[PDB]
Amino acid sequence: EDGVEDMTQLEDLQETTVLANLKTRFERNLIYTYIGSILVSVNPYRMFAIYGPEQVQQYSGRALGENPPHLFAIANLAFAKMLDAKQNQCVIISGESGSGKTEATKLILRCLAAMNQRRDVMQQIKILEATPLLEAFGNAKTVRNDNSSRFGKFVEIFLEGGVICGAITSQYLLEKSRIVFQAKNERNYHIFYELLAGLPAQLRQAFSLQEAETYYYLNQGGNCEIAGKSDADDFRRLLAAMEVLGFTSEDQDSIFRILASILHLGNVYFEKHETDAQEVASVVSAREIQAVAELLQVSPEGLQKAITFKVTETIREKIFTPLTVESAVDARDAIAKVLYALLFGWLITRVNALVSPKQDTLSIAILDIYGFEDLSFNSFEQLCINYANENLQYLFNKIVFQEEQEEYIREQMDWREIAFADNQPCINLISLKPYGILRILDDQCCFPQATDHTFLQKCHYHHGANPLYSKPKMPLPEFTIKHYAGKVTYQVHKFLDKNHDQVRQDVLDLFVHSRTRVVAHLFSSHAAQTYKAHTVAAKFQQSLLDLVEKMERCNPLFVRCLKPNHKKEPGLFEPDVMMAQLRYSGVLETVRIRKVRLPFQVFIDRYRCLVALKLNVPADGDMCVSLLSRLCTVTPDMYRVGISKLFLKEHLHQLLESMRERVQNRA
Amino acid sequence: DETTALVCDNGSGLVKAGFAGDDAPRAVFPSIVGRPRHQGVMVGMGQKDSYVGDEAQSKRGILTLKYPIEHGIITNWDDMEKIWHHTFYNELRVAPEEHPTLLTEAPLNPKANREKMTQIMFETFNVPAMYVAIQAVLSLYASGRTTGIVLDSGDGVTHNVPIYEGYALPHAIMRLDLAGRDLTDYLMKILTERGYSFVTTAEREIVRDIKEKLCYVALDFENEMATAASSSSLEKSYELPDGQVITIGNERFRCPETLFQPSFIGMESAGIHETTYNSIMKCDIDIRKDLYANNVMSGGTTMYPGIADRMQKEITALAPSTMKIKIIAPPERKYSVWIGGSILASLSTFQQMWITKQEYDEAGPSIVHRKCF
Amino acid sequence: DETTALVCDNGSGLVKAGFAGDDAPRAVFPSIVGRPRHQGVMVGMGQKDSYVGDEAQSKRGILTLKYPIEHGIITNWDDMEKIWHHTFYNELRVAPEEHPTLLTEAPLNPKANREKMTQIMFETFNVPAMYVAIQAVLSLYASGRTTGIVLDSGDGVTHNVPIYEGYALPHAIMRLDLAGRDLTDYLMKILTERGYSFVTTAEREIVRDIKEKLCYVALDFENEMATAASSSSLEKSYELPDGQVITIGNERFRCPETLFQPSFIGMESAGIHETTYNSIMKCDIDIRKDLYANNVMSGGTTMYPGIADRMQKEITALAPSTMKIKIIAPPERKYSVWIGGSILASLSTFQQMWITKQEYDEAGPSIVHRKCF
Amino acid sequence: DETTALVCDNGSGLVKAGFAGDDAPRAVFPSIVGRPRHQGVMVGMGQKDSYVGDEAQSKRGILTLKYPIEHGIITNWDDMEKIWHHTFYNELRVAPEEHPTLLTEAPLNPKANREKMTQIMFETFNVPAMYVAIQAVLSLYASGRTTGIVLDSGDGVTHNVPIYEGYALPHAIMRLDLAGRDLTDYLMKILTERGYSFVTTAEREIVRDIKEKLCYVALDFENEMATAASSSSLEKSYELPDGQVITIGNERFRCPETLFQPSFIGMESAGIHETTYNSIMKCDIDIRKDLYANNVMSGGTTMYPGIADRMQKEITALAPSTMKIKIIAPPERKYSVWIGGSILASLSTFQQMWITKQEYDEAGPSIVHRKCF
Numbered sequence A: 001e002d003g004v005e006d007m008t009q010l011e012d013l014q015e016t017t018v019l020a021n022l023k024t025r026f027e028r029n030l031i032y033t034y035i036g037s038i039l040v041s042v043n044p045y046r047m048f049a050i051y052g053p054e055q056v057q058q059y060s061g062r063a064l065g066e067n068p069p070h071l072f073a074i075a076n077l078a079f080a081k082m083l084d085a086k087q088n089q090c091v092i093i094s095g096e097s098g099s100g101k102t103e104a105t106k107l108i109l110r111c112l113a114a115m116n117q118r119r120d121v122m123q124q125i126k127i128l129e130a131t132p133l134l135e136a137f138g139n140a141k142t143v144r145n146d147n148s149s150r151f152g153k154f155v156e157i158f159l160e161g162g163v164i165c166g167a168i169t170s171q172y173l174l175e176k177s178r179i180v181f182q183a184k185n186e187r188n189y190h191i192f193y194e195l196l197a198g199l200p201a202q203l204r205q206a207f208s209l210q211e212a213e214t215y216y217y218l219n220q221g222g223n224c225e226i227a228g229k230s231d232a233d234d235f236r237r238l239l240a241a242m243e244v245l246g247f248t249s250e251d252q253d254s255i256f257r258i259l260a261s262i263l264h265l266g267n268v269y270f271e272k273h274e275t276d277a278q279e280v281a282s283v284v285s286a287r288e289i290q291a292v293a294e295l296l297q298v299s300p301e302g303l304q305k306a307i308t309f310k311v312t313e314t315i316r317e318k319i320f321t322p323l324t325v326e327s328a329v330d331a332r333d334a335i336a337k338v339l340y341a342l343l344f345g346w347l348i349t350r351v352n353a354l355v356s357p358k359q360d361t362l363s364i365a366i367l368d369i370y371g372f373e374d375l376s377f378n379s380f381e382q383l384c385i386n387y388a389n390e391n392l393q394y395l396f397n398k399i400v401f402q403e404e405q406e407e408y409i410r411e412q413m414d415w416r417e418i419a420f421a422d423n424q425p426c427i428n429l430i431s432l433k434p435y436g437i438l439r440i441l442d443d444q445c446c447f448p449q450a451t452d453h454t455f456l457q458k459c460h461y462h463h464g465a466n467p468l469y470s471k472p473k474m475p476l477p478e479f480t481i482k483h484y485a486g487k488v489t490y491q492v493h494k495f496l497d498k499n500h501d502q503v504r505q506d507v508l509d510l511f512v513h514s515r516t517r518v519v520a521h522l523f524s525s526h527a528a529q530t531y532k533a534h535t536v537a538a539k540f541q542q543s544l545l546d547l548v549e550k551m552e553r554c555n556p557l558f559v560r561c562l563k564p565n566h567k568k569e570p571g572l573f574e575p576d577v578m579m580a581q582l583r584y585s586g587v588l589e590t591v592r593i594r595k596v597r598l599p600f601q602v603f604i605d606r607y608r609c610l611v612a613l614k615l616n617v618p619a620d621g622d623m624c625v626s627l628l629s630r631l632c633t634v635t636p637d638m639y640r641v642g643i644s645k646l647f648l649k650e651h652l653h654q655l656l657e658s659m660r661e662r663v664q665n666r667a
Numbered sequence B, C, D: 001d002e003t004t005a006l007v008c009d010n011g012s013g014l015v016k017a018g019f020a021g022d023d024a025p026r027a028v029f030p031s032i033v034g035r036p037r038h039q040g041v042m043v044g045m046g047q048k049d050s051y052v053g054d055e056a057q058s059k060r061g062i063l064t065l066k067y068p069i070e071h072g073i074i075t076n077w078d079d080m081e082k083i084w085h086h087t088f089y090n091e092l093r094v095a096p097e098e099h100p101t102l103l104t105e106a107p108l109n110p111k112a113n114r115e116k117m118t119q120i121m122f123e124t125f126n127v128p129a130m131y132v133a134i135q136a137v138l139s140l141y142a143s144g145r146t147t148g149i150v151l152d153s154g155d156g157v158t159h160n161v162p163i164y165e166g167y168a169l170p171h172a173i174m175r176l177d178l179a180g181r182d183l184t185d186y187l188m189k190i191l192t193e194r195g196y197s198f199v200t201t202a203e204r205e206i207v208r209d210i211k212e213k214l215c216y217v218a219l220d221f222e223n224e225m226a227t228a229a230s231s232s233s234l235e236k237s238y239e240l241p242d243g244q245v246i247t248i249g250n251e252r253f254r255c256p257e258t259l260f261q262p263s264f265i266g267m268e269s270a271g272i273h274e275t276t277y278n279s280i281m282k283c284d285i286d287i288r289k290d291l292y293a294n295n296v297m298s299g300g301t302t303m304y305p306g307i308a309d310r311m312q313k314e315i316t317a318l319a320p321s322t323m324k325i326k327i328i329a330p331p332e333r334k335y336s337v338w339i340g341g342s343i344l345a346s347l348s349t350f351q352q353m354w355i356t357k358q359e360y361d362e363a364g365p366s367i368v369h370r371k372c373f
């Protein structure tokens, strides 16, 4: 009931006032708030079957000024804008893990499918079935959530003359460092544990997978049973959906073979064994690599020479080089990461090809993206996540400033001259070409005799004078970057081991000549589709640039999601949690965009006791401010007299408050 | 605008080039300019009057082989310009006006060499930026180290450069003019003891191939001479390009020993082990410990089987008996300098140390003496 | 609000710091500021342009060692500020704005030294309170006594301070500029007699290590010189950081004898025994008895084996034959001053003798001359 | 029985000898021992297996030049014995067993050097008496003075000795190992910038001749570098012994500047002006006045045209602005030490300060440490 749909019209905009408004609306069983172009949603933990097909006709765009703020208004807004400006656009779903982003995606897909009276006839267009599968491949347990999206899910819904066509799904910002490394009290991607829990016996005797609790890629977390809510029934339903997608049993068997090969590669160790003139490397147990070779249809000596020797090959000769232990570990980790990424790309490509729509058609975008993260201790993954969220916050700030400018021009022409300060310096501090932090890290990757301390010292030197950078006082292995959401302190512990994604051409050549068809096809396709680099940060930056280009091809308009207390309590929340989520989402920056402005008729009406203020003013353009300005010697802080009088400044507001408080001391 | 910078290790006898960021040179061919000498009789086949390295390798029998680079210094400038033009256009098929280029050089080379190199690579090919780096620092870059003495021994020069934690000691740099080409000439002069005569340039390169495929360095010289002239166990046979079989005895290992005994050619200098020890003893004591512990190799002419063991034995005999000598002999002694140059040119912090065209145009060619080393 | 006050004995050659109430200094490292001198060739390793004491100890071979404190007085203020900042942040990891600090000083040092020390430690580090205490009174505090003459002989100064029951005699304080650093320089100059040449700063510190590990003081000089140049029993060998073995003969004990015979360096002053006797004979007779009976030592340069016996013999030869001379040589001659400072700073009755920030701000830096000593 | 005592100034690179009482050395020749290295083919001309200084100068092309004296200390004793025998018999034609001999030495040389010198000159040549005198006191004798600092800079050592009215100050004697031979080596290393290569010993001596005939010291370094690399006015040409003409530019004056800037060779020491000023500031104030007023020079390597003016400018910049600096540069900087030795050996009051054969036989060689200096 308590609407306050547009908080721009209030006397002043503060985070406390916004929090109070959201609390009041949540107590009114209202979730969505229509802040002009932007929308805000809160996870209610409450099953709301809002209406049904009637809501499209009830919450259409014809009465946006009177219609309640709802998520489904954007469904009609998209069509209304594309039928007028003749330009497709994109919609992003952003928010921290567990904020109902998947629920919002399902709701918007249902609304778009239900608006054309055709989905009942062509429900065979098999669109959303694989969402749990991509979830099991792309989600993992975090210290704050048991279901966290760790990849930039992208679903493209295609349209042609009002007819809903097929869809194309893609991944953008998957973190490859999770497969080999994982922090404490967290674990790897859910599907490894699902496979190990739902493993049938025939795979137990055939594939040596009796060490499900002692794999190095999995035991790193220290406790894999915290996710005990998941079980082998998830594996059974995953297999049911997998068969539904038209995959033969051979494809599933090959996928399990690759996953078992990755898990076995996780359990490979090296020894600092003596050699001709140095001590380089030696494989401890050959039975494990032999078993890897048996189930991968590839020579075992190939793997030995690809993870132990470095190949420098020219036209007239090919020279083998012994490798150090750290280099061998990096090569093994790169092999595992590239195998996992190729599996994900293959599955996404097949899913897209099954329901591939027509080409050269219209398209609406849905983007599932990360949330701003600030843990007790932060690592490389958090830095990449923060960089991506910084780019998206830059886009959001651009949108907000565009809305402010168009409103100002709609009022009077001459306020387009108002400026705006963006977060470009932070983006340059992170990844500017000459001396960016990620560029310094990339240089340190290949630099001889490098360690974490040297990288930290170089970062401290090159960014001492940067206002956003913050050198710690004590000699601590940390640094602090001033994001838009506040100060974040990272730890430089183990960055150099999270970037050595070097895959020499000999490994790809070995995997092309594999006897199995799927692996050979995947590596051949990877070599055919392939300028690039050889670090996790560089690939992340390339994918982020591709995503930014795709977004700027269309018009960005999206929605933010917030979360109440994480103890799954419906209808109860902490205001501090609201403040934290509001800071992390980035909607607080709108207050900074406001930099204030109030109507002058409101000042005439409710200030009737200001020096016996005359209320008989029927004109908003009448001279009332300069009259008080020169008679009361009010400093002329105002730049120019407006018509609507939207020239109010905070210093003038403070002066008015001071005058109000001093005049009231009559008796 | 991503543009990979070319790395062109134009050594004294072989040109090794490629893009930065690779793991091996894209193109390897001898730095030879060939010109026909006989008279052409067939009308039409008298137009190709200059063959660059590999083509001149294929047609040795009807033309003369001239090396533009003699003992490090660039003698014939037109031939070197032809080689650069070939390796830019006909070999990599990459326009040089869109890519920065990196070049290597001996430590104690003349200055007019650098000035003319910069002038040619800025005026002719119009390269946006270029840089000249000493070969030893690139060898250390490629070895993944920061301390130790680099013994870079190409076929035109053999020089030592002591480096400790990135700070070079320029007063301990020693350079010898004894290199692989002089070994080839000694092999030509020492093969006449068995009756084989090699006089022309093609026969000189046949002798070079013999040296590459048969020569080795022994641990002890007197013992191996006695063994050679006490049996036929060390004799090996080689087949000339006309099916004529030659046999080599004690000449197999007496060719590369002149590196340790340069009195065979008559030079007054000392062997490479002695120069390395003297270069160490020109450094500070705290420097001397790590220089002892971290000897490294590079260059083609250090690929003889048994070089590392003998030079280790000689350094250990020279150095005090309580120190540990460990000589690094990676299997990429050839084109280790190129691997180091590729690593160096791929660094994003290196972008500010180029020589931009505006800098050269405003301050002249002398800045190559200021921004290098 | 319990806040332990820091005790920072910034001596002339070594910085010994820690918290009050401990029994040994938490951090001990030389007070050296090192700066590289050669040219950097590796791109990236050219940023650390100043190494504080221990880091500069580790990298002697590529940088120059400069001592900010020369003969007690602070010469280079920026280097000393760097050393203080290092020992506060990178060594103890304790913010200096939350802990009071105690500093030591030679007795007869200039006054601008104290004024600038207070100004730096109040304006830069914003210490809540600081105090400057003479080293001899702290040595007496650490020795658990209240009478006797302190012979504090660091590596920058050697001074005597007679105290009787807590009442100092400021007209009997004698100070000599002959200390350990001059002994090290004499050892450098006297080692050339055998052919060993030490010129650089790193070689000077190698000589310092030799002095610490081999030198001793003999009871009789002529007898020991005859013994040394009559046999090889006193010869000892030392190993330089490159495995080179050196042999030392009569130079072993002729280095620390200049303390008793300062004419070797050419100084006109007298030995430490003579200065102690003259300082006693500047005091009252009733004072003189207890000053005779309670000689005490401190400072590093009094750790030579045999110093106590010889100085006892010399004082007994100087003093009247009926008095008892007893020289206290505790095994903590090094950092006895720090132990005394820690005892003094932990007293609850000392809380009122600090120099609070309000006092310095209202009366200026001159109060350091009023509240000290 | 009138017997003139021989004066044999056996310096580090040249031997200057003669009789006492003359005004110039009778014999001057380099101290080089040459040995052939090639193989003799003519039967009969294979007997002269060692050429002393001047003969080895005449036949540089077929033999190796070795200096027995390296940086002051006598390295090879047999070669030095050969040089002494030559300069006694084949050069002066005077039996050494009938004439006393006087020898010179660096100040801070080792002691075994003196002991072996006395042993050789008493046992081999059977000289009736000999004496070893420091070179600086002889330079002061020859200059006709009794006060001032002697800057004796040969080709093996450069040392300062402050003397005031005949009383030496042995604690202010400073010695540097930077001398003329290191200047020659720097010239060899700096001539490669123009392409001239000098590696052998004969080429090293050709470079030495170039240094003697062309090098000079400028007043200002930056101005002269700009002038050199702004015109061709400073370029001079030299003719090698085969008619090949070489041209020298800014290398003309950048060779002898390392005396004032010894960082070019990498030494951590300071220039000769700085060492002279520091040696003065190690002396007493009343001494300091006359040391300022009476600087004197000697040694060959101080004959560069313009050395006096620059060192005067540098001392004046270092010394207080009110004092008068007057540097004595007599035109006999070469063999001034010999003139002083001849004056000293001709005094009749010197007859009692020899080292007689009976004294050496009864007390052993150690008396050379007692009767000298």
Ligand SMILES: Nc1ncnc2c1ncn2[C@@H]1O[C@H](COP(=O)(O)OP(=O)(O)O)[C@@H](O)[C@H]1O
Binding pocket: A031, A042, A043, A044, A045, A046, A047, A048, A097, A098, A099, A100, A101, A102, A103, A104, A147
């Ligand atoms: N607006 C909403 N209305 C009703 N239920 C919701 C809403 N948003 C989230 N939920 C419920 O909250 C639960 C938590 O899901 P969540 O962990 O947020 O999934 P994801 O993290 O993939 O978005 C979901 O099962 C969903 O049914």
Ligand SMILES: Nc1ncnc2c1ncn2[C@@H]1O[C@H](COP(=O)(O)OP(=O)(O)O)[C@@H](O)[C@H]1O
Binding pocket: B010, B011, B012, B013, B014, B015, B153, B154, B155, B156, B180, B181, B208, B211, B212, B213, B299, B300, B301, B302, B303, B304, B334, B335
């Ligand atoms: N395997 C080998 N064994 C012996 N000598 C070799 C070998 N390979 C190359 N060389 C010698 O190295 C010389 C040059 O090799 P390299 O150092 O690669 O080129 P550059 O000297 O131009 O850097 C050739 O003259 C050749 O004689």
Ligand SMILES: Nc1ncnc2c1ncn2[C@@H]1O[C@H](COP(=O)(O)OP(=O)(O)O)[C@@H](O)[C@H]1O
Binding pocket: C010, C011, C012, C013, C014, C015, C153, C154, C155, C156, C180, C181, C208, C211, C212, C213, C299, C300, C301, C302, C303, C304, C334, C335
């Ligand atoms: N065991 C030892 N034997 C001889 N001399 C020593 C010994 N330990 C230290 N020294 C000398 O004492 C000098 C300084 O020691 P110390 O008094 O502890 O520092 P400070 O002089 O700064 O108070 C050093 O220069 C060193 O030469």
Ligand SMILES: Nc1ncnc2c1ncn2[C@@H]1O[C@H](COP(=O)(O)OP(=O)(O)O)[C@@H](O)[C@H]1O
Binding pocket: D010, D011, D012, D013, D014, D015, D153, D154, D155, D156, D180, D181, D208, D211, D212, D213, D299, D300, D301, D302, D303, D304, D334, D335
């Ligand atoms: N006219 C000159 N100009 C420059 N240098 C000279 C000149 N004459 C001699 N020298 C240098 O002085 C060095 C030795 O000269 P001198 O002092 O006479 O002999 P010694 O050093 O043995 O006493 C030689 O190495 C030579 O380079």
Ligand SMILES: [Mg+2]
Binding pocket: A098, A101, A102, A147, A148, A149
């Ligand atoms: Mg999700």
Ligand SMILES: [Mg+2]
Binding pocket: B011, B012, B135, B153, B154, B299, B300, B337
């Ligand atoms: Mg090479």
Ligand SMILES: [Mg+2]
Binding pocket: C011, C012, C135, C153, C154, C299, C300, C337
């Ligand atoms: Mg002390």
Ligand SMILES: [Mg+2]
Binding pocket: D011, D012, D135, D153, D154, D299, D300, D337
């Ligand atoms: Mg001389």
